[PDB]
Amino acid sequence: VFLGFLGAAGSTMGAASMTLTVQARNLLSGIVQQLKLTVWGIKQLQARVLAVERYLRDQQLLGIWGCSGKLICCTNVPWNSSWSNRNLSEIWDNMTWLQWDKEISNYTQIIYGLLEESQNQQEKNEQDLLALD
Amino acid sequence: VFLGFLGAAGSTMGAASMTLTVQARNLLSGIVQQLKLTVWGIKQLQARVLAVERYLRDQQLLGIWGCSGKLICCTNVPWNSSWSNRNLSEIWDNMTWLQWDKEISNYTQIIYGLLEESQNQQEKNEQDLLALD
Amino acid sequence: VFLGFLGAAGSTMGAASMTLTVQARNLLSGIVQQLKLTVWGIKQLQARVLAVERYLRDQQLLGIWGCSGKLICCTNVPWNSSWSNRNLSEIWDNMTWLQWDKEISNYTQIIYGLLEESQNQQEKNEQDLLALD
Amino acid sequence: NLWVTVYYGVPVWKDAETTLFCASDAKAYETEKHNVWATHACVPTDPNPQEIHLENVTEEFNMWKNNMVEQMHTDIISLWDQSLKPCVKLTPLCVTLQCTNVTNNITDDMRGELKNCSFNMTTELRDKKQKVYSLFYRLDVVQINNKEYRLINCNTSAITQACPKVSFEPIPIHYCAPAGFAILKCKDKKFNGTGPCPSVSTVQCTHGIKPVVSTQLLLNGSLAEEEVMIRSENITNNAKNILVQFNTPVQINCTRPNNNTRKSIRIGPGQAFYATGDIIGDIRQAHCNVSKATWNETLGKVVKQLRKHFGNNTIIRFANSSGGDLEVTTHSFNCGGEFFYCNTSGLFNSTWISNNDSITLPCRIKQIINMWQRIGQAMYAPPIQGVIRCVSNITGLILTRDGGSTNSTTETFRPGGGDMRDNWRSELYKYKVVKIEPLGVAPTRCKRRV
Amino acid sequence: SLFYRLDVVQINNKEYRLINCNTSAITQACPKVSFEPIPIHYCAPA
Amino acid sequence: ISLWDQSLKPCVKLTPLCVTLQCTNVTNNITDDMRGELKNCSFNMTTELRDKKQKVY
Ligand SMILES: *[C@@H]1O[C@H](CO)[C@@H](O[C@@H]2O[C@H](CO)[C@@H](O[C@@H]3O[C@H](CO[C@H]4O[C@H](CO)[C@@H](O)[C@H](O[C@H]5O[C@H](CO)[C@@H](O)[C@H](O)[C@@H]5O)[C@@H]4O)[C@@H](O)[C@H](O[C@H]4O[C@H](CO)[C@@H](O)[C@H](O)[C@@H]4O[C@H]4O[C@H](CO)[C@@H](O)[C@H](O)[C@@H]4O)[C@@H]3O)[C@H](O)[C@H]2NC(C)=O)[C@H](O)[C@H]1NC(C)=O
Ligand SMILES: *[C@@H]1O[C@H](CO)[C@@H](O[C@@H]2O[C@H](CO)[C@@H](O[C@@H]3O[C@H](CO[C@H]4O[C@H](CO)[C@@H](O)[C@H](O)[C@@H]4O)[C@@H](O)[C@H](O[C@H]4O[C@H](CO)[C@@H](O)[C@H](O)[C@@H]4O)[C@@H]3O)[C@H](O)[C@H]2NC(C)=O)[C@H](O)[C@H]1NC(C)=O
Ligand SMILES: *[C@@H]1O[C@H](CO)[C@@H](O[C@@H]2O[C@H](CO)[C@@H](O[C@@H]3O[C@H](CO)[C@@H](O)[C@H](O)[C@@H]3O)[C@H](O)[C@H]2NC(C)=O)[C@H](O)[C@H]1NC(C)=O
Ligand SMILES: *[C@@H]1O[C@H](CO)[C@@H](O[C@@H]2O[C@H](CO)[C@@H](O[C@@H]3O[C@H](CO)[C@@H](O)[C@H](O)[C@@H]3O)[C@H](O)[C@H]2NC(C)=O)[C@H](O)[C@H]1NC(C)=O
Ligand SMILES: *[C@@H]1O[C@H](CO)[C@@H](O[C@@H]2O[C@H](CO)[C@@H](O[C@@H]3O[C@H](CO)[C@@H](O)[C@H](O)[C@@H]3O)[C@H](O)[C@H]2NC(C)=O)[C@H](O)[C@H]1NC(C)=O
Ligand SMILES: *[C@@H]1O[C@H](CO)[C@@H](O[C@@H]2O[C@H](CO)[C@@H](O[C@@H]3O[C@H](CO)[C@@H](O)[C@H](O)[C@@H]3O)[C@H](O)[C@H]2NC(C)=O)[C@H](O)[C@H]1NC(C)=O
Ligand SMILES: *[C@@H]1O[C@H](CO)[C@@H](O[C@@H]2O[C@H](CO)[C@@H](O[C@@H]3O[C@H](CO)[C@@H](O)[C@H](O)[C@@H]3O)[C@H](O)[C@H]2NC(C)=O)[C@H](O)[C@H]1NC(C)=O
Ligand SMILES: *[C@@H]1O[C@H](CO)[C@@H](O[C@@H]2O[C@H](CO)[C@@H](O[C@@H]3O[C@H](CO)[C@@H](O)[C@H](O)[C@@H]3O)[C@H](O)[C@H]2NC(C)=O)[C@H](O)[C@H]1NC(C)=O
Ligand SMILES: *[C@@H]1O[C@H](CO)[C@@H](O[C@@H]2O[C@H](CO)[C@@H](O)[C@H](O)[C@H]2NC(C)=O)[C@H](O)[C@H]1NC(C)=O
Ligand SMILES: *[C@@H]1O[C@H](CO)[C@@H](O[C@@H]2O[C@H](CO)[C@@H](O)[C@H](O)[C@H]2NC(C)=O)[C@H](O)[C@H]1NC(C)=O
Ligand SMILES: *[C@@H]1O[C@H](CO)[C@@H](O[C@@H]2O[C@H](CO)[C@@H](O)[C@H](O)[C@H]2NC(C)=O)[C@H](O)[C@H]1NC(C)=O
Ligand SMILES: *[C@@H]1O[C@H](CO)[C@@H](O[C@@H]2O[C@H](CO)[C@@H](O)[C@H](O)[C@H]2NC(C)=O)[C@H](O)[C@H]1NC(C)=O
Ligand SMILES: *[C@@H]1O[C@H](CO)[C@@H](O[C@@H]2O[C@H](CO)[C@@H](O)[C@H](O)[C@H]2NC(C)=O)[C@H](O)[C@H]1NC(C)=O
Ligand SMILES: *[C@@H]1O[C@H](CO)[C@@H](O[C@@H]2O[C@H](CO)[C@@H](O)[C@H](O)[C@H]2NC(C)=O)[C@H](O)[C@H]1NC(C)=O
Ligand SMILES: *[C@@H]1O[C@H](CO)[C@@H](O[C@@H]2O[C@H](CO)[C@@H](O)[C@H](O)[C@H]2NC(C)=O)[C@H](O)[C@H]1NC(C)=O
Ligand SMILES: *[C@@H]1O[C@H](CO)[C@@H](O[C@@H]2O[C@H](CO)[C@@H](O)[C@H](O)[C@H]2NC(C)=O)[C@H](O)[C@H]1NC(C)=O
Ligand SMILES: *[C@@H]1O[C@H](CO)[C@@H](O)[C@H](O)[C@H]1NC(C)=O
Ligand SMILES: *[C@@H]1O[C@H](CO)[C@@H](O)[C@H](O)[C@H]1NC(C)=O
């Protein structure tokens, strides 16, 4: 369904689970076009550099959690329940993304580290192992 | 054959179909190196930011038409003939890229939308389906 | 082993062969945050643009040597021994990356060209061949 | 069960600060110091201001803790700056002026209101000097100890005459947000100013915001709907300001009915100064008309709304401001290029119980304006030639309380302020910037662990 | 000083002045740049 | 260097000081353990008004 930019903000997470691209497109705004010092000129350029910098930070994060085939990354290792344990219906029948981030805001830096370290290192050097026969 | 930058401009599209990388390399010019206001300084920086901005716009487009394994993307869905229907020989034995873009210049924004929406959404959530068994 | 940024500099190449990500993370420094002309302002921005420019140059190189699944690219074609022929133990039991680059510094631009041309063109148009049946 | 999953494209934001750049339309032509205002370096707006109402959303806003007002205020200062870097620096004016009266109508219905001053001045040649003369509004000339007078801001600031190419006509400015951000607009017709707005929308960037400079009276602003809202973080506090916002554009007609003459004096080389050559025409007094009926009725609507914060058992009094600096005592604003200071006693002069004709406002005209209460800086508007006739809405109000002594029924409110950032908060109250984090971690039956 | 009579103007010995003065300001170039045109290469960004 | 510069762009330019100074000695301790080390100078100077001047010291 064509919601639009943030169009699924007022929807359960599984609802927004289909409209991901619409936000991604707005990460350059195309034509933007945005002359001496020119107040609003420095602003224009500082804006664009901020935008690409922002974009590249997270694209880097995804490079690290090596998927690049984004919107979905899935492996076969279980998940830790300690971090605000909740039910399936408590998420998909009871929560939208907004309310969800309020609760998950604590464990982010934790999760970043192990998704970074564990799979990258394990999937590493096994390709090195199978590069023999 | 080592044509060079745009070296296959005067060639049928299938001819240029082998020299794609040569243009891609020129998308940073390396050493470029291009101090107060310094007319040509603002020019230098505004140039570089324009370059990476340009690069990232299209790299984004390719991110959306999710391939990233560029120069070729192919699926198994048919193609619409309505848009300036022509023959195979009318393209490879009768046309170079230059003449081709003149004719295709109308349907671009159309094509962008469905290549963006259709395959992304269909290939989406099926990975979600096969993440069960 | 958690060495850290460049932490495996004083180690054989196979040792550093596990700590690759740690340098990659430092390619944006996150919070950096780095107002009129403001000496150190122009410096800040010129720095950030230099950083992303640097990043994108090599990411481009990797785009060309089309892997994007980085840290390892491997095919089945032999390798030329002419370029400073050495032994396996002469590398993994006798050399760290530092000492290695001193010796390989000559053949870089050579290697870049064939890794760019050969596999890209061969793996090209064969996908075009198998797009028939 | 529930297991870990990564998504990209997750429509989630955070409260944040970032920089916002201008977006305008191509109408950049005027005649006082550069351009239109500053806005010709602006990027042209999209011809389709795309919006989208967001169903089901509830986000708390804080029109009193918003940051966009801050960026906006600094940028408007700086744009005024940049318009004032390149034109003539009028330092050699600060000279002893020989002034006499301008004998206005006998006996006095202009009381002069302007003095006739001759003075020495440099020439094209850094040599034998010249004696010129000009007419100055006695509100910007000061004595010493005919009598010798001088410019007011001189012993404190430098002065910088705007040349004749920019305007001061406010042009709709569109604050636009750089990619990766978003602008939230509270769509709720009934909104206090803060707290959770239920009906909201997202836009790529805002509407045209006439950046008018005004005091005590929101001019040309936006209008409220179905009511006349009242906004302030702590009404029960007497140290905030009450932001009233009308439903009905109460007209006001202001004019300067003189045919004034521009006399050019060369402060050579190449720099030229525009003095008031003379005044011809009907020498009335600069003023503003307002339909008494609509003002009284609408201010009664205000009576209702002020009551709703203080009880149907009260009496409210509107008095004029209690004196002080000129820039706060009056409805100061800019209009046709000129700068008007209207005394508003004739508009807050009434106590109100629990339950054409037109009003004339006599305004004075200032020249050496000190903008944004900043000292050390001084723009010098040039005498705008011709007759000035300038019409406007008044959509809101900015009031100050003094009560909570024997606080039962009789409260007295007077107008004032002096910070434009109030003006600015009155149109950005519906707006809030959010940073987007298209990275997302969430559980589904995709699986990874520690 | 000696001035080329092509850049001095009269009034009404006789008193004269610089020509661009009653219209423009003047800005003596100091002695380090040249005016010798040097080959400029307009280069195009990537 | 440049930061020193930028700190010195925006504050007062003291050109009209370079004026003929009327200086005498500052009679420091008799006979001399400061040898003056400072002179007492009065001078003409411009005013707020580009007009009748002032005599400061
Ligand atoms: C709240 O918002 C409202 C709107 O929502 C604002 O109302 C605006 O108020 C201003 C101030 O007066 C109006 O702008 C000025 O109007 C002057 C009056 O001229 C008009 O009437 C005459 C006679 O009926 C008409 O002939 C004019 O029409 C012609 O002129 C205009 C403008 O040139 C053209 O656009 C038309 O196509 C006609 O050709 C007007 O209708 C008018 O003199 C003035 O024009 C000068 O100023 C502008 C900008 O300042 C310059 O770009 C322009 O070139 C003129 O300036 C040069 O020309 C004069 C000629 O003598 C010289 O003397 C100057 O020195 C200079 O060289 C301008 O149009 C405006 O019209 C009005 N809004 C609307 C929608 O009407 C309120 O101001 C605002 N609140 C406050 C507090 O300001
Ligand atoms: C600031 O100044 C401006 C201009 O001076 C004022 O704008 C005027 O506002 C008045 C008030 O409404 C308008 O007057 C009314 O106009 C109506 C519509 O105009 C038609 O009729 C007139 C003839 O009156 C024609 O000339 C015109 O072409 C239109 O066809 C009329 O219907 C009104 O007349 C009715 O009421 C009067 C009572 O006053 C009766 O005597 C009539 O018989 C009739 O019943 C009236 O004329 C006026 O039109 C506006 N100006 C213009 C140019 O249109 C602002 O109001 C003023 N603001 C303030 C605060 O002072
Ligand atoms: C600048 O303008 C002022 C007035 O605006 C002029 O001031 C006048 O200056 C003259 C001297 O040039 C004064 O004359 C003096 O008179 C006294 C007493 O008569 C006499 O003793 C002096 O010897 C001298 O002649 C004159 O009084 C004074 N007038 C006023 C009103 O202050 C001044 O001349 C102008 N300067 C230039 C360069 O145009
Ligand atoms: C908005 O401003 C008002 C003041 O006009 C704030 O009310 C003031 O709150 C303080 C403490 O929060 C009170 O101090 C103490 O209050 C108690 C109980 O009222 C009293 O017994 C003490 O003697 C002492 O005064 C103060 O009295 C009170 N004043 C008024 C007029 O109510 C109010 O808190 C502000 N809003 C918010 C949200 O804080
Ligand atoms: C401000 O006051 C000055 C006086 O200090 C006024 O200047 C003088 O105004 C009179 C008439 O108002 C002009 O009179 C003319 O004098 C000439 C020569 O004497 C005579 O031939 C004419 O028939 C006429 O009588 C006089 O020129 C003028 N002086 C100057 C230097 O301009 C001035 O008019 C006052 N300002 C205003 C706006 O009224
Ligand atoms: C703003 O406008 C108001 C009027 O709208 C001005 O107030 C007026 O001020 C005069 C002089 O102070 C008051 O006159 C008084 O009259 C009595 C009785 O004759 C006399 O005994 C007093 O000594 C005084 O002369 C006048 O009543 C008063 N008007 C009102 C309605 O209060 C005010 O001065 C203006 N202020 C500014 C800054 O424009
Ligand atoms: C707002 O309205 C009030 C009431 O009309 C004005 O206050 C009045 O202002 C006048 C002067 O403007 C005061 O006159 C007094 O005269 C004595 C004796 O000469 C003098 O010594 C005082 O300094 C003062 O000027 C009058 O007392 C005062 N009355 C009240 C009740 O405030 C006020 O001026 C108006 N302001 C504006 C901006 O409209
Ligand atoms: C600036 O300060 C200097 C001293 O620091 C002052 O210099 C004095 O200038 C006056 C003229 O205004 C000189 O008077 C002259 O005296 C000679 C001989 O007595 C006489 O022939 C002249 O006609 C004239 O009256 C005085 O000698 C001189 N003093 C010194 C020590 O140089 C000057 O007056 C000050 N200027 C201002 C505008 O304050
Ligand atoms: C699942 O998460 C819990 C906490 O959220 C982890 O508990 C940690 O255990 C280590 C090892 O004893 C302690 O050093 C930490 O202090 C514990 N965490 C906290 C917050 O106290 C638990 O280890 C995680 N599961 C696994 C398998 O490691
Ligand atoms: C192939 O392209 C044609 C036009 O290029 C499409 O025709 C559209 O059909 C829809 C549905 O009736 C209309 O709303 C449009 O107006 C048509 N296009 C034009 C340009 O008029 C056709 O639908 C496309 N093929 C498919 C399978 O959709
Ligand atoms: C392996 O590398 C050697 C040199 O490092 C290559 O030798 C080149 O051979 C070509 C063809 O005769 C000559 O034109 C070059 O001059 C030779 N190189 C040098 C440095 O002289 C050799 O060709 C490479 N292996 C293969 C299979 O091409
Ligand atoms: C802000 O709006 C609210 C209602 O939308 C006004 O009253 C609130 O009332 C609830 C009870 O239903 C209280 O819990 C809130 O604390 C109240 N809001 C505030 C800000 O205190 C409120 O009056 C409005 N704010 C102002 C300043 O008028
Ligand atoms: C306003 O006056 C009314 C009656 O004069 C007071 O009574 C309220 O009236 C409103 C009707 O608009 C009802 O919705 C309320 O339920 C009534 N409440 C009570 C307690 O009578 C009302 O209290 C007055 N409001 C204020 C703020 O004083
Ligand atoms: C302001 O309100 C007052 C009181 O309602 C009006 O009455 C004037 O009060 C002053 C007080 O000394 C008297 O001097 C005046 O004579 C009164 N007016 C008249 C017409 O006699 C006053 O008219 C109101 N004025 C305005 C401008 O609102
Ligand atoms: C005050 O604001 C109103 C807003 O309604 C302006 O009214 C506009 O008037 C013109 C012509 O009368 C209409 O074409 C517009 O549609 C009106 N606006 C709206 C939103 O409907 C009015 O112009 C403003 N005051 C002045 C003096 O311009
Ligand atoms: C003012 O200070 C100077 C600084 O040395 C004193 O110097 C005099 O210089 C002259 C040269 O012409 C010598 O003849 C004197 O002997 C020096 N004086 C001394 C004390 O050594 C000068 O004396 C000082 N003047 C006064 C009045 O104190
Ligand atoms: C997150 O951490 C804050 C820090 O105190 C805490 O108040 C909050 O309850 C925590 N929420 C969850 C879901 O852990
Ligand atoms: C305004 O109207 C009300 C009634 O509608 C009246 O009581 C009041 O006196 C009027 N205002 C004035 C200044 O007379």
Residue numbers in the entry:
A (entry chain J), B (entry chain F), C (entry chain B): 518 to 551, 566 to 664
D (entry chain I): 33 to 141, 150 to 185, 188 to 309, 312 to 321, 321A, 322 to 398, 411 to 505
E (entry chain E): 174 to 185, 188 to 221
F (entry chain A): 109 to 141, 150 to 173
Share the article's original sentences.
Here, we detail the functional development of a V3/glycan-specific bnAb QA013.2 isolated approximately 6 years post initial infection from a HIV superinfected woman in Mombasa, Kenya. This bnAb binds the V3 glycan at site N332, with a footprint similar to that of the bnAb PGT128. The QA013.2 bnAb has previously been shown to potently neutralize tier two viruses from clades A, B, and C, as well as several tier three viruses from clades B and C, but it did not neutralize clade D or A/D recombinant viruses. The mature bnAb is only capable of neutralizing viruses that contain N301, N332, and the linear GDIR motif.
A 4.15 Å cryo-EM structure of QA013.2 bound to native-like trimer showed recognition of V3 signatures (N301/N332 and GDIR). A cryo-EM structure of the mature Fab bound to heterologous HIV Env trimer reveals that QA013.2 evolved to establish a conformational epitope that spans V3, with the majority of the antigen contacts mediated by the antibody’s heavy chain, with additional contributions from residues in the light chain framework (FWR) and CDR loops. Key regions of the antibody paratope include the CDRH1 and CDRH2 which are nearest the N301 glycan, as well as CDRH3 and CDRL3, which are in close proximity to the N332 glycan. Seven key residues in the Fab CDRH3 loop (L103 – I109) lie adjacent to the conserved GDIR motif. The structural data also suggest that the N301 glycan is playing a major role in facilitating antibody neutralization, based on its location adjacent to FWRH1-CDRH1 residues in the antibody VH region that we show are critical for bnAb breadth. However, unlike many other V3/glycan-specific bnAbs reported in the literature, this bnAb emerging from HIV superinfection relies on residues that span FWRH1 and CDRH1 to achieve cross-clade Tier two heterologous neutralization, while residues in CDRH3 are less impactful.
